[PDB]
Amino acid sequence: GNYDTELQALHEMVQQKVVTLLSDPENIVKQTLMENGITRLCVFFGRQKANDVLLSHMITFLNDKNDWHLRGAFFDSIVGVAAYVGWQSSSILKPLLQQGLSDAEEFVIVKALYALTCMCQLGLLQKPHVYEFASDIAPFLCHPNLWIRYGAVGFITVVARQISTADVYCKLMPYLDPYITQPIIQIERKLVLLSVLKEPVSRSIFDYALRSKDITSLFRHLHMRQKKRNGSLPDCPPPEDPAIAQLLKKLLSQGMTEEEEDKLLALKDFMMKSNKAKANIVDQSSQKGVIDLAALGITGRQVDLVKTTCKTELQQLIQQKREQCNAERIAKQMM
Amino acid sequence: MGEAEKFHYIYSCDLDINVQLKIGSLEGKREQKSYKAVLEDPMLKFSGLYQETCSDLYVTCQVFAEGKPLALPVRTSYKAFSTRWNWNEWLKLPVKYPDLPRNAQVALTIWDVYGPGKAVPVGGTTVSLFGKYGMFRQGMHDLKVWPNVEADGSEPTKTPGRTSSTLSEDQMSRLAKLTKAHRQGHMVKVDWLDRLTFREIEMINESEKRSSNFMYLMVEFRCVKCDDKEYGIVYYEKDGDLTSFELVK
Amino acid sequence: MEGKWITDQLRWKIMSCKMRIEQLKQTICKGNEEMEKNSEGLLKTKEKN
Amino acid sequence: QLNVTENECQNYKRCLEILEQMNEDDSEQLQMELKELALEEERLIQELED
Amino acid sequence: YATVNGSLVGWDLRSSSNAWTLKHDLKSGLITSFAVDIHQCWLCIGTSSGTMACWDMRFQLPISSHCHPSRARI
Amino acid sequence: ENGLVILVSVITSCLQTLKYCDSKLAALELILHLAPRLSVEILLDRITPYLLHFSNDSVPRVRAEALRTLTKVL
Amino acid sequence: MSSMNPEYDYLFKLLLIGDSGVGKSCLLLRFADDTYTESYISTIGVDFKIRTIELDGKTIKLQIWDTAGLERFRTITSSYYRGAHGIIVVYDVTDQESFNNVKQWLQEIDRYASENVNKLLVGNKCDLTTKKVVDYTTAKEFADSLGIPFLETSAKNATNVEQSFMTMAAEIKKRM
Numbered sequence A: 001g002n003y004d005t006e007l008q009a010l011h012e013m014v015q016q017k018v019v020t021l022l023s024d025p026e027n028i029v030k031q032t033l034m035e036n037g038i039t040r041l042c043v044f045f046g047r048q049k050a051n052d053v054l055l056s057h058m059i060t061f062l063n064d065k066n067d068w069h070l071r072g073a074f075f076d077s078i079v080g081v082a083a084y085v086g087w088q089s090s091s092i093l094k095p096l097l098q099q100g101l102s103d104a105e106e107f108v109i110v111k112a113l114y115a116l117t118c119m120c121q122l123g124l125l126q127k128p129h130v131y132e133f134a135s136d137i138a139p140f141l142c143h144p145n146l147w148i149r150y151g152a153v154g155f156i157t158v159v160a161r162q163i164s165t166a167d168v169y170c171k172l173m174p175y176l177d178p179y180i181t182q183p184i185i186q187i188e189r190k191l192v193l194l195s196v197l198k199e200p201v202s203r204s205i206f207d208y209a210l211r212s213k214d215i216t217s218l219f220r221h222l223h224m225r226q227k228k229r230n231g232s233l234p235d236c237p238p239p240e241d242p243a244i245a246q247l248l249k250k251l252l253s254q255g256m257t258e259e260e261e262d263k264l265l266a267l268k269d270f271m272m273k274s275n276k277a278k279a280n281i282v283d284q285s286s287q288k289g290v291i292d293l294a295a296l297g298i299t300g301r302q303v304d305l306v307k308t309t310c311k312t313e314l315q316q317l318i319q320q321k322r323e324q325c326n327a328e329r330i331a332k333q334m335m
Numbered sequence B: 001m002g003e004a005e006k007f008h009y010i011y012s013c014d015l016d017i018n019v020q021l022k023i024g025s026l027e028g029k030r031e032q033k034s035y036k037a038v039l040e041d042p043m044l045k046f047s048g049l050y051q052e053t054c055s056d057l058y059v060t061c062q063v064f065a066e067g068k069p070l071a072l073p074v075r076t077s078y079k080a081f082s083t084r085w086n087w088n089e090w091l092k093l094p095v096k097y098p099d100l101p102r103n104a105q106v107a108l109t110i111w112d113v114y115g116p117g118k119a120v121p122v123g124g125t126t127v128s129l130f131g132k133y134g135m136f137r138q139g140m141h142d143l144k145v146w147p148n149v150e151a152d153g154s155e156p157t158k159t160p161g162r163t164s165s166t167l168s169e170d171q172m173s174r175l176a177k178l179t180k181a182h183r184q185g186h187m188v189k190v191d192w193l194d195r196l197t198f199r200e201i202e203m204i205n206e207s208e209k210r211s212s213n214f215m216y217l218m219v220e221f222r223c224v225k226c227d228d229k230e231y232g233i234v235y236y237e238k239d240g241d242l243t244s245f246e247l248v249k
Numbered sequence C: 001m002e003g004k005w006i007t008d009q010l011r012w013k014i015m016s017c018k019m020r021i022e023q024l025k026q027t028i029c030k031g032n033e034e035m036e037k038n039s040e041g042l043l044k045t046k047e048k049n
Numbered sequence D: 001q002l003n004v005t006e007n008e009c010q011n012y013k014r015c016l017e018i019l020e021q022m023n024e025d026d027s028e029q030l031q032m033e034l035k036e037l038a039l040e041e042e043r044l045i046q047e048l049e050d
Numbered sequence E: 001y002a003t004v005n006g007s008l009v010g011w012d013l014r015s016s017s018n019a020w021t022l023k024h025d026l027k028s029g030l031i032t033s034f035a036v037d038i039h040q041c042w043l044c045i046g047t048s049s050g051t052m053a054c055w056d057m058r059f060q061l062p063i064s065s066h067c068h069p070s071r072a073r074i
Numbered sequence F: 001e002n003g004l005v006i007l008v009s010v011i012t013s014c015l016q017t018l019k020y021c022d023s024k025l026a027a028l029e030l031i032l033h034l035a036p037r038l039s040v041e042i043l044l045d046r047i048t049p050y051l052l053h054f055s056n057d058s059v060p061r062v063r064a065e066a067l068r069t070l071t072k073v074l
Numbered sequence G: 001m002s003s004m005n006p007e008y009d010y011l012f013k014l015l016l017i018g019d020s021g022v023g024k025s026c027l028l029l030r031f032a033d034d035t036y037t038e039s040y041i042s043t044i045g046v047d048f049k050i051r052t053i054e055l056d057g058k059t060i061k062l063q064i065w066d067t068a069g070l071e072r073f074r075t076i077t078s079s080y081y082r083g084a085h086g087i088i089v090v091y092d093v094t095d096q097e098s099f100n101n102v103k104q105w106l107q108e109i110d111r112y113a114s115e116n117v118n119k120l121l122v123g124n125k126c127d128l129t130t131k132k133v134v135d136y137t138t139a140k141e142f143a144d145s146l147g148i149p150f151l152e153t154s155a156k157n158a159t160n161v162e163q164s165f166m167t168m169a170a171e172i173k174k175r176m
């Protein structure tokens, strides 16, 4: 044989199937492929082919807005594909990673944050991007969701380990300062950072703000209240919109403290994007746990209870139902 | 006492829909570790065991058959819990009705946060998808959660959720089955007896809850209806439907 | 920053120590409460015996 | 690239000035406090053992 | 049938197995007689110490225990 | 291994006439257990051709297992 | 003509339902027995207190069933609703989850209960004003959207509770 002709035949055979799988009609097949072989396939397609063929296909998974598991699987496997495509893929993944940190399914944010942790740990993010992501992720350090909250710790701790101690104090510390209770230089220890985090936003406050339909007006009003605390505005006018008046009264009535108002503003970008994402899902939406057989067109077999190994177990089920039905009737009939 | 003169059933090979199981609520107390435990591993302080409210737990359900996973585990979406762990979420399992073997089991493991990026199991339970008579489970089922262990999919499971009658009959388990059998109308209702008997059950359950601190995770399986009749899925193989020869030696 | 690094090393120990001291105090408080519950139980059980 | 270098240079100039302007925290005072906290912990360890 | 050690056992003469088993509190006295409800929902055990203990047969649990004021044998 | 060449012949003579799904899976179990003990020539010549035959079986569970078996055997 | 009894001109089966820890037991104890306690025994199965009342000079014997609020004592079918004349759905004003599930209970009532059953949403734990998270208008829009009677009550700070049972009896009498 001729080695390049045979090797090229192998690449052609694997490339045809991988693309066949990444286009399967059942999302579970895509997810299964991502967990069982996405790293192996990158070696198979090659560095150049993997970005144009693989990454281009993997990016299409973030477009599935109905199945949050797939978007999660995207962030779980993108780490491996990106590792093979190389830093030349980072420009394509950068916009995608920012989209994950604002997913509709709170678990997708957990996976995306973890993905950013893994990607940063591997050095797959360019120097300017690492700082830019830290600025976008630092607000999560106060999120009420413990998975997200600890996920943020994971990102900040990985970032803190990746940059120089000088850059940690000169650049990393300024992004974290609004969310930390004490200035500790040993941010590189996971235990230290977890201990210095400010208390998260109250779930009632966070959930009530993210659930507010007028999140723009709420944040606009909140920005006026923050400007009052910052001295930029002498007096904050009461909310012009009664919907914001109701919300501001409710948030204060629910225990919104000045620290919780500051935390909400730090999380503003995340909360604003997430709200829009949740609205996009609602716009697309047998919700009853009941499966309708008429809708499936399946003809069931029926046996009256009044009077092969699978056939034997079936006969046992029929015997049990027949006996149980008569027994229940007898008890009522006896009364 | 209810009635049903006809049993409507369908072969599991004939139901071409995904099997869905709703992980409902987990009722019970998760015990906190001693301070010495927090001294041994300081990360324990940041674990979900130290959140005062019900931590936002999720259950990953993976179907196993003969000890091999049939599909990837499916996880409940993140939900914030206040006073009770109540998911009320219908999970779409990655297994179809025709693809489940007769010895198929669903392993549900409840996980909690254990520091940054690390999940530790709260407890696991495994329930067979087909009953002792090959009928797929129906209705609401309360599965005993084994603390500090992942749900085990080997056959027989080391973390069984439905303790069969062959083992030590847990008075709580027997009474729980009886309370449910009563609720559905499968037991004769005696008004005067019920007030006293159920009050006795309440005392037993209260006493058992104090000594057996085990958590029980509720899982509900979907029911199939056609023309208002409920159909049961029974394990059946697609191909389920001369010893002496005069010439052929 | 070499100096600041040394100071922050002390600050981590201090915050950890305060947490450890507080956790120790909380554990001791629980232990005394349990010993009290066991003592109350012991008295009732001694009477029961 | 030139602007990025100037911004990083400015940040280092500012950071050096900030570290130089931050009053030198008394290393000895913190060390004395740490010795006191260690004694309290040792006391709590004996008390916890008791 | 009820035994001296307080065991009330129902032997199913069809399958030779014990259909149900109840354990009476001997503190309530020796079992002297018992009655089973016509509706078969419950059974009541009378004792030598005058205690009348009520048992629910549907759930197979002892529900209530009452003693005669005179404590006379049933 | 000299004896195993003859043993493989008994299984392989049956794989084409299996009727039950229980048997089809069992046939695959035999191949999986015997595969690590056969010579490479026997694996590629006498075992490999039958797994691809099973991959066209009417039982989806069998088609999946055929792929699992073929993957492990190879 | 038919046989009737002087002890009650009408007998109304009431029925308390609602998630765990909402206050279903304490409502029953506060109405039937003017009783309260902080000690919680999770209701299992069924309970059946009695209070006899006179309304419009007609005599109504209320028979006010509790029900299980834990899920592990609960089933997709439920025969308890059968023959019920009134149904009382309860939530705890400090437990948003217990509030949200009210729609699920109305799904239960509509599947099993008598076709004309008088519902009545009762906001128990209304003594918890420090922790109220479902407020009057929030429930009243929902309750009025169904046309079900509504009240807020505390079995701890009893007085609201009385009107809850009086309301149920009234709405039953209007049907009877």
Ligand SMILES: Nc1nc2c(ncn2[C@@H]2O[C@H](COP(=O)(O)OP(=O)(O)OP(=O)(O)O)[C@@H](O)[C@H]2O)c(=O)[nH]1
Binding pocket: G018, G019, G020, G021, G022, G023, G024, G025, G026, G027, G037, G038, G039, G040, G041, G042, G043, G044, G067, G068, G069, G070, G124, G125, G126, G127, G128, G153, G154, G155, G156, G157
């Ligand atoms: N503050 C306050 N607490 C109440 C009130 N009513 C009930 N509770 C508390 O909630 C507990 C349970 O009341 P239940 O009636 O048993 O609630 P439930 O829905 O029946 O709970 P289950 O019986 O398990 O179904 C009581 O023991 C009290 O602790 C109330 O009106 N105010």
